[PDB]
Design a protein around this ligand. Sequence first.
Ligand SMILES: N[C@H]1CCN(c2nc(Sc3cnc4nccnc4c3)nc3[nH]c4ccccc4c23)C1
Length: 193
Amino acid sequence: GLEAVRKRPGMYIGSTSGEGLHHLVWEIVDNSIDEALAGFAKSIQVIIEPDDSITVIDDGRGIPVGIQAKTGRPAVETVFTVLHGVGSSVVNALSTSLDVRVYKDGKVYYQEYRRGAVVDDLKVIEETDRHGTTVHFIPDPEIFTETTVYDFDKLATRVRELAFLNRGLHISIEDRREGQEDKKEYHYEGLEH
Ligand SMILES: N[C@H]1CCN(c2nc(Sc3cnc4nccnc4c3)nc3[nH]c4ccccc4c23)C1
C-alpha cells in the first residue's frame, strides 16, 4: 500500500521539490474544504509551526470514527492508512509523523502514525465541547531532500484564492517561525454583504 508511495512519491505528488512539499498542505486542506462544502465547517486554520511542520484545524463534524464492517477498523484510521479529497494517506506516507484529533460527540479521538505506520489504536484522550478535525504533520526530509522549508507567501496566496472560490468560508494562514511570525485571515461575504 503506502510503501509504494514512499518509494515512488513522484507518481503521487508530482514532485519531491518545494512544489511537492506545498502540495501536502493542499491535500489536507482540500478535505476541510469538502467539509465546508457539505455545509458543516465554517472556518479553517492553516499553521506553519516553528519546526516547519503543518497544522490544519477545521470546525466540521469530525472525520467518522466508527468501525467499518468492510475493514474492522475505525473510518478515520482507514482515511490515513489506505491509498484512495482522497490524498490524506499520501500525506501520511510522506511524513515522519502525522497526528489526527477528531472532536465529536463530546470526545477527542486521537491517533498518530510514523512514516505511514500506525502507532496505536484510535483512543479517546480528552473530553470536548467543540467539533471538527485537526491534522498535524511533519514532512519527511528523506522524501523532501531539496527543502522542507515552507513559503508563507505561497501558502497565503492560495489560501486567499480558496477563500474566494469558497465564498463565505473563513480561512487563515499563520506563520509561527522564529523572527517572522505573521497571520492573514480571509473571508469573502455571502448574501449578508
Ligand atoms: N471521507 C473522509 C475523508 C476525510 N474525511 C473528513 N471528514 C470530515 S467530517 C465528515 C465527513 N463525512 C462524513 N460522512 C458521514 C458522516 N459524518 C461525516 C463527517 N472532516 C474532515 N477534516 C479533515 C481534514 C483532513 C483530512 C480529512 C478530513 C475530514 C472523511
